[PDB]
RNA sequence: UGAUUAGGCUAAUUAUGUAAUUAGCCUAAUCC
């Protein structure tokens, strides 16, 4: 009965995700110790003709990046665990992420370590002129 | 890369999958969004209304090696080196029906020391917001096996409640054995998911209030404290596991138990398949195989009993020899053939069943010697044999008493802990029907140089009055005395013993 | 029309007669 999700490669760094009280901070140490970073995200085929901003909701890619699935690339997704926001709900589930070319080798990861502008909606240090 | 797994699994009724934006993988997207080139196309087709979709906790694997985060699935070995941490750890099921199919959810939770919780059936769903840890509908499974799982059905409490009694429970049990907790469990995947609802996980921390090791944690707190500071707390920090079915064995629980115990039988609860797998373990550790190169530390007054044990064994034997004139002695259990009392001149021969001297034989003791070794007395100090001649003196310990060096053992025996673990078989008072309790007396010989005890043999006493001397020494030795009596070890004579004989010296 | 593992059969895809993965069905073991 039902339908598999993931796969066997991701089911351990997932499973530690479930049990540890911060779960960003485990991920984060499993990659930089030399874990492999997950895989099977829900990449999109775009047109690379987009405006660039971080969130939206459609694709909006540029030349030098890719978009992504929202819940393909938020860790409390990915493992299936409680969101540490505000009721719960979820800022990349329903929408598109663009990633910058040079961290898709890390698509989750990226989110668990930059945040978007307040103001000009792009990543800091990635499309952000707010100098 | 391509082999799936059921972690995770989409257990709703759903007959098409998400849309690219609201999928968590690439494999649970509908077909109709994929292309050749693995990837995704965000059609005008219209976004689903609100959904609920229930996702499996069954599969998980604690294998990952981070540096920091100490490893949890023990091997046998630091599972020996942890046996005061053992709690035995069994769940049963129910499952997930109606709008899910797929999963298995907790009911009902026992433990090792006789205490089952039951629990309202709760999964994790998934929305188009996120996830919640919610109730869901769930079904008893079919069968006479599980007949008694219906009515539990409706007793359950939430689970905020039961992680926090789970964590009373834990502490209460090991405050005093222990800073870790060990679960053993005979299968560690439902057990694993059952965990997952009130174990976390992390790097080895402190308690707050102390410098013991953290073994609970508090999220209303986000704080680690240990069992004795863990009031309020709801999660277990760090536990360990252990998988007796991984050790070698065919079969389910019940006939891997029953081959080597008879005492731990019952109605089927989920404490009584933890007791079960608790006790297998116990035999598969420390009746099949024997590690005495571990040694354990120290938890309490056990240098004081094992030099009071000493005090009492010169004294007891020395009174024995004295009275009857015996000119001959039997060690069973000495592997060093070292002599204990040496004031009357008796020869002395050592026996045990791995001895580590030449002077000492291999004699293994079945009973069948009654005659043999008559003619002198044998000595049974903490020497285990189910029937005793008559012509003896036994020193063995009432596995009846629990204590912080005793822990439950195998088919009524029990785990004594002292610098090595020895395993006692019950204590059962029909190995002594040729013997007679030892009684409480004080005899020495030593120079002399208010208290009235008609037990204390001293010359002295002869005369009716007593020394200083002697009487600290008896104070001292009835201190002793009474702390062995206490600790659990119990002396036996042959029936001719008396004290007055005692007297003619 | 509860879960996993091992074997067998079928279908699809991929690779180069044969293999891998996925999906379904049967058998056995354990868990429920
Ligand atoms: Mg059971
Ligand atoms: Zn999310
Ligand atoms: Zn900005
Ligand atoms: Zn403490
Ligand atoms: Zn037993
Ligand atoms: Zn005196």
Known sequence: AGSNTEFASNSSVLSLVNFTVDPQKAYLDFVN?????????????????????????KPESTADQETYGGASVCLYCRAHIEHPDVSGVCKYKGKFVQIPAQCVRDPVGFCLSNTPC???????????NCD | ????????????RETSGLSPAYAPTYVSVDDKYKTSDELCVNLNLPANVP??????????????????????????????????????????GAHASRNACGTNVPLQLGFSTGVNFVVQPVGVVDTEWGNMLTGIAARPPPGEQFKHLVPLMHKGAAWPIVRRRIVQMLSDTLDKLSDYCTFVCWAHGFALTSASYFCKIGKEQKCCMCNRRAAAYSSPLQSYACWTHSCGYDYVYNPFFVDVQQWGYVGNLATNHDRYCSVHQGAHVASNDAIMTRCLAIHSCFIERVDWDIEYPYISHEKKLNSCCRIVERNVVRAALLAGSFDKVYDIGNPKGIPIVDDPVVDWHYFDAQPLTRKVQQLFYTEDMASRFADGLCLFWNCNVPKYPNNAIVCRFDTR????????????????????????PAYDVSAFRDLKPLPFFYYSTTPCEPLKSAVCITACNLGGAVCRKHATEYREYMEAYNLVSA?????????????????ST
């Open chain 2, 1 to 12: 890369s391509q082999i799936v797994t059921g972690l995770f699994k989409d257990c709703s």
């Open chain 2, 51 to 92: 959904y609920s979709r229930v996702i499996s906790r069954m599969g998980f694997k604690l294998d990952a090696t981070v540096p920091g985060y100490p490893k949890l699935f023990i091997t046998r070995e630091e599972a020996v080196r942890q046996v005061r941490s053992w709690i035995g750890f069994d769940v049963e």
């Open chain 2, 401 to 424: 008493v629990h204590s912080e060096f005793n822990l439950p053992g195998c088919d009524g025996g029990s785990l004594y802990v002292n610098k090595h673990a020895f395993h006692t």
């Open chain 1, 118 to 128: 307040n103001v000009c909606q792009y990543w800091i240090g990635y499309g952000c």
């Open chain 1, 33 to 57: 110790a030399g874990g492999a970073p997950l895989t099977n995200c829900v990449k999109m085929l775009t047109p690379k003709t987009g405006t660039g901003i971080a969130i939206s909701v």
């Open chain 2, 487 to 503: 600790s659990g070890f119990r002396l036996w004579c042959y029936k001719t013993f008396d004290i007055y004989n005692l007297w």
